[PDB]
UniProtKB/Swiss-Prot annotation, chains A, C, D:
PANTHER family from the UniProt entry: SERINE HYDROXYMETHYLTRANSFERASE, SERINE HYDROXYMETHYLTRANSFERASE 1
Residues modified to N6-(pyridoxal phosphate)lysine: 245
Residues reported to bind pemetrexed: 40, 60, 62, 106-108, 135, 191, 219, 291, 390
Major subcellular site: cytoplasm
Function: Catalyzes the interconversion of serine and glycine with the conversion of tetrahydrofolate (THF) into 5,10-methylene-THF.
Known EC number: 2.1.2.1
Phylogenetic placement of the source organism: Eukaryota, Viridiplantae, Streptophyta, Embryophyta, Tracheophyta
Name under which the protein is recorded: Serine hydroxymethyltransferase 4
Amino acid sequence: AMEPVSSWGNTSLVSVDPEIHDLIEKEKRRQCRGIELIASENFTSFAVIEALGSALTNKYSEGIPGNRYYGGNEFIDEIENLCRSRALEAFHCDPAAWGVNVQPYSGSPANFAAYTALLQPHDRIMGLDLPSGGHLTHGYYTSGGKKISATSIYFESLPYKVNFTTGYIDYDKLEEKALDFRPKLLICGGSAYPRDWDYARFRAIADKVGALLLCDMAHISGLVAAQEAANPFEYCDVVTTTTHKSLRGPRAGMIFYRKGPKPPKKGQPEGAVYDFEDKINFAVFPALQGGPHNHQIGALAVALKQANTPGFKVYAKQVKANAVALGNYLMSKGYQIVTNGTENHLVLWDLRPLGLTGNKVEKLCDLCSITLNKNAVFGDSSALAPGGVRIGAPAMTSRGLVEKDFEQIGEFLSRAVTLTLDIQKTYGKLLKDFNKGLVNNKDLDQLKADVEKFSASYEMPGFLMSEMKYKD
Amino acid sequence: AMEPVSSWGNTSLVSVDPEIHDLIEKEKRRQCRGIELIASENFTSFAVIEALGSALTNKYSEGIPGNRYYGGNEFIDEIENLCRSRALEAFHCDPAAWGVNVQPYSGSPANFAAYTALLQPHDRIMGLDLPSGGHLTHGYYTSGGKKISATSIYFESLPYKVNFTTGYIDYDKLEEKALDFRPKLLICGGSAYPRDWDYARFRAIADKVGALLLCDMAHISGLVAAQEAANPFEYCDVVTTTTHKSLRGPRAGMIFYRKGPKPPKKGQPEGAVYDFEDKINFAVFPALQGGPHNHQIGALAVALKQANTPGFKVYAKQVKANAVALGNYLMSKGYQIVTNGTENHLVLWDLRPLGLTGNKVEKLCDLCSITLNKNAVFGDSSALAPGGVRIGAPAMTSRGLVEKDFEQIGEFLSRAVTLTLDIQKTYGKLLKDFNKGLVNNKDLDQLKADVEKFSASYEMPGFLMSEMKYK
Amino acid sequence: AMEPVSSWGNTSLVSVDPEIHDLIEKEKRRQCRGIELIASENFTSFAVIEALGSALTNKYSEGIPGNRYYGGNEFIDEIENLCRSRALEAFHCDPAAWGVNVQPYSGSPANFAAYTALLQPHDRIMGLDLPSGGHLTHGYYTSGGKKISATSIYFESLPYKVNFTTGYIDYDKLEEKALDFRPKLLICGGSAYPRDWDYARFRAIADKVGALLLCDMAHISGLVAAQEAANPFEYCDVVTTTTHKSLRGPRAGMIFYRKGPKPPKKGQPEGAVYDFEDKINFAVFPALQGGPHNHQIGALAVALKQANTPGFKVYAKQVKANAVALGNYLMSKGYQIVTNGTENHLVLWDLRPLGLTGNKVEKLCDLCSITLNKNAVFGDSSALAPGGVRIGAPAMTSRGLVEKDFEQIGEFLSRAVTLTLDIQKTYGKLLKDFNKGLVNNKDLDQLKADVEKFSASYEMPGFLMSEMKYKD
Amino acid sequence: AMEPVSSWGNTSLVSVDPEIHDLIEKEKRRQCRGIELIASENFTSFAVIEALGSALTNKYSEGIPGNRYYGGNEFIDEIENLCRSRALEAFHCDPAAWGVNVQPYSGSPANFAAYTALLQPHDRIMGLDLPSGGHLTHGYYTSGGKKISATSIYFESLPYKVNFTTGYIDYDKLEEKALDFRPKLLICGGSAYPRDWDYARFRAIADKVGALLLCDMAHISGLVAAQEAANPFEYCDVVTTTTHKSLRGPRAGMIFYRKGPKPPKKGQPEGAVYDFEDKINFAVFPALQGGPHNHQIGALAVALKQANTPGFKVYAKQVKANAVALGNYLMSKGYQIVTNGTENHLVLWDLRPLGLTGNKVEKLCDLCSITLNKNAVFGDSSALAPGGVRIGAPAMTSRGLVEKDFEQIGEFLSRAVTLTLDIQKTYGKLLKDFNKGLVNNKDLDQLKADVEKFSASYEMPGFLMSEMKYKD
């Protein structure tokens, strides 16, 4: 006789699996007690989480609204239709001119499905170089010829770079490379670029070379929705994105695409219309994915309602103000940040004038509950180790921090790199020598204590600190 | 001034987004007031759902445990390590001989990651034909040459088929085709095959052509774990799977791969070891995916603990017994099911002797709250419309139903097919004429009321019916 | 000062390069003192050879008539236009329905240019399996997965086979395979098939799968021109060929292609015309080849004028009659030939009922001035060594031999096989042991003397035996 | 009842095919009554032509010497062995360190076989841009992305260019592009570059990216053999070539390749040996070609003996001296040539200061029996039409012309461009209007008469003007 539904199927997690419950509670405390500066990280809302953890996971719904493979989809269809319509609203798109597919499981699935829809295998693609701040999904191969990204495995990629002196995208060199290489797809957007993008110039270049133009706005999508960044939809054919990061939603992806008549073009028929919609939907399903994750789609619909509010626009402004305040604090102490400022959510800190690598600063910061990541500076790939760190404002801004709180984060960071220099001075630059300073270091222990006391004093979206298992 | 954190960030869904809360409540009612017979569907536990909706969604953890790109992953690592060890335990794998990657976002990403790891672009692949019960991810192109599956877009696929007459896999024709085509990868496993798989013969055939052998056990993984189906790990190089369907977990995928010393093969260096682990891990990340969905991984760990219990084995046996009881009931009424029985969780009902297409039955059933799906029968890819339906036992067995209950489902299905025949008699075979009978049909109305009364009488996992909005 | 023009530039070969002159003279003697049974070989006319060795080699003429890259092509254009129209005439083609490109350097270039014109890289192709009598250029990979043919390197091939019992093409199994594999191109034609081809059935199969249909008629082109074989042009979209072999011309290739209105079809616009011409021309140049070999094209024009005569049809009839006579002779001695006959220029002799490999017979025959070649039988690839030999009539028919002379060739072959059996009896079946009987063998010596006396008694086209350096 | 062998088979071309005989005679007169300035053109010897037009055309010899598929090859083997040894000797190669395959049907087949042997489909290749003086076989795709060369269809090509100001190869931009693109094969060699090549620098660049280094020496091979050009074999892995053009042989190709121990390198296993020989032979046959053209191989053997003489070195010196004399003559009259000189067999004349396109000069020259061709200048591809012409010295040098005679060619070319300007002045720059001056133009008729009288005063290799049908 089967174990009754009430026993295996309705009992709470704490009773069914205490081991996993305890680990989630330790993770909740860790999220409270640290300074989260990873620029792709955020803390999403309880309401998002409630839709994410729901019976929507129980429904297979292959196809799209109106064109499903089987039945029972009356309410899945309303949810997905509402999610699509809220996505277009949040990004201020006319539905007569733009559509969206909200089924991609995450950002990288969204990008590969866009490529699969738009290109043939082996077609040429250009994206921002990884050491210049691009993302793996935009193409990456090593100097030894090893194809790392599946984009470089299944297509033919060539990167473009920032100017090695200024840290800005070298638009003239990109134009020159694209005229030589003739990509079928030109990608803009990136993961570690501290300035806004000139989409109008990308459109000029794409038109010269005959390329499709795609923007991957994953890192900045919250700023785009809030009209706190340049609008890629004004110039790009397709726009991909994650829904987490600065949009503060669940982990998922979206693909936006143009619809309707095409703008006037050289020697090509009158009345021509875009033909992206069917290709993109078909690439997502049946080509690449299986059943949608309807709980993710439901949670995304919640996130998009939350993003299309006056409150979210104030958040987006504060994210930017906090990044500027942190960058200015660091610069005031003599530190050097790439381009000497920022226009978005992140700062790139050049550690070479300190004689440090980002590997050392990242390792020491992680030991005092500050999470950031090493990052190449000025597009360099010849340095043994990356010469900088990337630091982002979205996550701590979501916990209510404002400029003065980010200036205190700046001083914690200044303390961290001072300790890092102290270790390197005492023990040396070699990592097995540097590691000697990371154990039994009372100054490091004290910085960890200060960081955790600071972090633990702010609110937290998504769960109630007052009810968590580990409150200290 | 920013909105307080508590306002946007801690308020419940019912208050933040009443529209979406209301649609989830309507869907909750729909799930426990219908007869869910879609063979890939199941109803997972509240414990899984609680880990799924958790703060684990807030952590980026690119890499694998012990080799992460970022810091702060001390507890993510413990969760993923526990998930991996529980997956190996559920499927009775020696960790010295098998590893697993639990990051694939779903079943289809798991398969494409496995192909990326093991194959070069345009390498040849063979899998069960979609009309014979295979899955899209095993390859599919149309008679017109259109490449539908990404597997057929980026690789070179060729399907193998069931026997036209018996409905069993034709292993002799498969071996003949594999000798001619010389796949680099032979895929076993399927989505609509009602019998178990001769893995030993797949290994014999793979060895004759020097192919890798992969089993996609997505549909039967719960039966495999409970040792209620033959074990593909005994013979396959790699096993991919979903974690929902018969395994009753979250939507996610896993890739299992051999590790350690290889068994003897002529032309193989003494001491040779498998080299799958690094290639599979690398294909998942950095090649294809980005950050893992750690809430899925935590929820999967819960599901794998629940699966590795005596209770789950009782469930898996009951799923099979319910599928048999339903198949036997239909055959007792004179209906025809493919291979005249089943060895797993599903039954294929051949509707051709009735003069009915699968879509007519699927449509009428959906209007009386019975969800199944049309399905080709005996590998047929000529017929205008599929000639059968596929019915699965996992989801309703999860609501506590046993053989007698599945015999009542059988009577509901008999009534549905009778009503379909009645409409076809009166309005005709053209779908545009048939549809006229689906409106203002008092027989159809009554069948729906009966089905929903029936479905209402059983328990429901994952949420409390006593708390739902629409009772 | 430079060497005077008349010294290096006008002096005869005999004086400029006595070493090569001597070698050509030894090869001329070899050609008219042996029995040439290689089914792909012929002996061409002096008039072809005079055009082949001419000042036409000095002219670069990239492009096609009416559309060259260079000037100075007035007379080259006239020659190439003549050659094209003579090609269409020789194969009874309406020039409104068919065109031809005569620039391919040889047969294998003609095939690859056709694939490049018609297909995308990695498209699927089906041709007759090499062990079933197909050609390497139709696709060939080993059981170990080694891609041997460029066709299998750059495209995706799958072969079809003869019936393993009867030796005929298994058309039902071909249709079954084509429906599964769905090639974009189906190839017919072969190098070692003793029967004619059911082109109507290939067309029915190609239409069922939507394939283009190509005939590589290289081996039988002279028979086709003479209307002594079924006409591939009635059913195939494209026909490729060598111009040597049974057509008796220089070594070159041609690609014929349909032009003008298409036959009725589903989903095809009314008034649709074939679109092969520009693609095939462009594939030959600029895609694959460089300057045409105008001496080849001039020599080909001569051969096509010679092929379109009553006398050539009599020759083609005689070729067939001689192959049948030889096959009948062998069968009357108890030997076995595949399909128990022939309908074209060649015979496939099954040596397995004699306990012999084709390798042994080919080697002993070669030492006795009989040239043929080993060949698989009944499509077998599992054997160690091929179990048969292929024998063709075109070359010795060109020296004037008729049925009774080919029956004498049969008796030489019987003697050769009897000698091979005697050697195998004395020295063994292992090839290394067998070879011991091929040195200082009195009966081998005698058979060689008799073969060469026989061969020397016939006329020889292409050069004057009365003027050659080595007459005895 | 066959036609007698002597009738179709031994009768002379003049009797068998008067139409073709007549056209070859017209082409013979055209060759020795005009000024041949096509830099890829030459006039080969009668001795070469005698081997080219010979019974060697009758022999199938698939395989290589010592590894043939069937028999009868005793003398074909001696010829091909002698051809290969004479090729290595003419290019001063140690046969322990270099091998050669002499079967490629022409230059473009030689290149594609080398690519098939060395590379996988879609591998990256870099070669000199067509507008910068490269060859189609090195890669070519249009600005619209149309893949023109098979090299660009089956592989992934990217060109490098000359400096737009100086006309020399821009080695710095080449190294920059190779570092970004990471080709598997770097190609040097070209069709319209007037300076020598820095092979040592190409090797430095190839080593930085791990590429193979191939030289296509087709245009300069006679200079390389004569040690009148830098030696590509010192630095390249593989060298391909035509055998016509400056080497003055038949139309054929060769692939040379290193063998034996590899030179020391970092990360290179000790004792490493080259692995090209089998891959290249196998690519030529069976992968790409069928039977060798043994008449081309014999004619090539002749040409290689003629090339390895002191007389040929004086020819190569004179070719270069004649190109310099012509370039200096044009510069003395105020014309501009690219790089202000030449180091090889050709000159590039920049017509832009005159307001002329090469199209107009080439067409007017063709009308007065001067054959040259238009050519892009300084790597420009933006012009509506090329701004230069390319002029080569090999063909007229082979008819015995020396510096004084090339200065008369220079004055003839000055007269041609002066008349071209006259037509343009009176009718206009639109080629539609320009053509109005090319008919019934008295100065144009007189220049033609002066050119043909001059040309008739020189000797002619390959045939006897005293025996030709169409004398003056």
